[PDB]
Amino acid sequence: VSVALGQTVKITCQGDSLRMYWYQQKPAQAPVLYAEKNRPSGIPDRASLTITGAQAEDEADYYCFGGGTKLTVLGQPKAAPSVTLFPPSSEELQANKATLVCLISDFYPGAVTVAWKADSSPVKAGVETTTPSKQSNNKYAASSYLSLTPEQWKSHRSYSCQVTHEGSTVEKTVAPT
Amino acid sequence: ELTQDPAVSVALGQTVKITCQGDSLRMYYASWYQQKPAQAPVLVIYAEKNRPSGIPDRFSASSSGSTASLTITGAQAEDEADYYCNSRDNSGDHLVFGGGTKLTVLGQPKAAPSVTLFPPSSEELQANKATLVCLISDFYPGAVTVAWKADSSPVKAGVETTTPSKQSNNKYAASSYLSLTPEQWKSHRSYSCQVTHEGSTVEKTVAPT
């Protein structure tokens, strides 16, 4: 969930007990403070939460308990990820190893979801994905990798890496030889 | 309205006690949350005595007066996180939270990084691109220095390296990539990725085929 500076956002909470009947948590900080119509005090003033005037400091997790909503305050333009799926190299295959690397770069905001496929079959066994971190251009980079045996690599028609980034999905597919 | 030290350390397999202090703790039992970077908080203990399903038996909680404590016996590598206490706050149906305590688990087994260097893929060369990727995995502690080479010449421009993050095995992973044009890739005899991890340096080399 992202918003531009000075723009309007809506964070939504879904589940039971909402038919019958606010905490802000910045990274490595305590979730600080009621129910739809209430007047709090201590932090600057103005189920779903709406923020009319958004500042870079407002970038935090909001909780109604909900799973958590990472509100991103756009400090720069949105950028879809550049996705490159690298197949196992000849050198790695000659060493009886196979690793596929899905390189994800130049994206903003810094949140992605990665899914893998063996042919048309979704796979998650042997998958590791790194936490996005800032490049020198202030955009983000991450990598997801899938460890396979060379027999698994050669016995499949293809392998795919799918990257989801705020309503955009980029899938890259590679095939042996 | 609850106080706890910002950080604490323990040795692997040893016991750690994280304490919270506040007037509300004399009236209410504390709940404990575990939070790792880029992850949703996990309820580790509910109102001192309830351990939810999925939470290891290593976690327990106790209290005395205006203090509440979370005890981790036989602290594991997966237990490194920020631990926050929470409770109700006297006259008023609202919750108060502690500032959080970051836990460091010392004496964890060290590991040299596994380094895999990929040449440009056939799809990116067909698209007039020649980015190389250097996968750095299964290392501990989570700090590396990455340097690239064009034959024997060090490369500064076009290099990006990710901050190491934990894998599901509690070892770290990172990647470094070098953006090149097919021209730069084909003109050199080889390119290298050298990774420095404490007393170890691992370098891999790829060549155009």
Numbering used by the authors:
A (entry chain A): 10 to 30, 34 to 45, 48 to 60, 70 to 87, 99 to 211
B (entry chain B): 3 to 211
Publication excerpt:
However, low Tmapp values do not correlate perfectly with LCs amyloidogenicity, since M7 and M10 LCs unfold at temperatures close to those of the most stable H LCs. However, M7 was found present at high concentration in vivo, and yet no aggregation or toxicity was observed at presentation and during the later follow-up times. Inspection of the SDS-PAGE gels shows that the proteolysis pattern is different in different H LCs, suggesting that the sequence of proteolytic events, and not only their kinetics, may be characteristic of each H LC. It is also remarkable that fold stability and kinetics of proteolysis do not necessarily correlate: M7 displays the lowest Tmapp among the M LCs, but also very slow proteolysis kinetics; H3, H6 and H9 show relatively high Tmapp, within the H group, but are almost instantly proteolysed by trypsin. With the only exception of one of the two VL domains of the M7 LC dimer, the two β-sheets building the VL domains are in general easily traceable; however the quality of the electron density for the CDR loops is markedly dependent on the LC crystal structure considered. In H6 and M8 dimers all six CDRs (three for each LC monomer) are traceable in the electron density; in H9 and H10 five out of six are traceable, in H7 three, and in H3 and M7 only two CRDs are traceable. In some cases (H6, H9, H10) CDR3 (residues 89–97) participates in the interface; both CDR3s in the H7 dimer lack electron density, while in M7 and M8 CDR3 residues are located far from the VL–VL interface. In the structures of all H LCs and in M7, the association interface is roughly symmetric, and is located on the five-stranded beta sheet (strands 1, 3, 4, 7, 8), where the 3, 4, 7, 8 strands establish the intermolecular contacts.
